[PDB]
Design a protein around this nucleic acid. Structure first.
Length: 55
DNA sequence: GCCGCCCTGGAGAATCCCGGTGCCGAGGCCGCTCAATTGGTCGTAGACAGCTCTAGCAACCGCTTAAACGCACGTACGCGCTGTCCCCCGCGTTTTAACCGCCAAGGGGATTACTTCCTAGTCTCCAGGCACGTGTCAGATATATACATCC
């Protein structure tokens, strides 16, 4: 009985994809392990910088 | 009496406005579809605690001595002014090639799918290279002592 799946971006209240950023961090040869909050934080920072330049 | 010239009225055509209908840009909807999500398991990265030894730090001392500082002088150089000439800019005219639109065939390269096999990851065991400490040894250096000599 799986629950209703929701995205990690909606959990973090973001528009940038947390899962895509996590996959690019895991396959980008940056470290052996990637923490859970690191793609959330990096997606938030990227979304903020995009918001500043777009405004 | 006959013919020519000036003044004024109503009907035909051009233009503005509105309604019906067709076409371009964008958004909602649907379908595929693959990558994010969820759930469970497990190994290990890192947090935590503990002991030992070394570096840093605040505030003080004392001594030395070379660097910093202050001052006077002088003169070299930054800067302003003037001349001059030359070279770059503005403009008119002529050329010319960039740009766009065309063949004509062929290869390079990006994808999609598939097959195969070689090579690199992983695991276990072992041994020798690297790091550290030390005994020993030959080259470099300083002086002890003996011989020739000037006054």
């Amino acid at each position: 009985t799986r629950a209703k799946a929701k995205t990690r971006s909606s959990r973090a209240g973001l528009q940038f994809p947390v899962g895509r950023v996590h996959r690019l961090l895991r396959k980008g040869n940056y470290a052996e392990r990637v923490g859970a909050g690191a793609p959330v934080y990096l997606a938030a920072v990227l979304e903020y910088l995009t918001a500043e330049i777009l405004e």
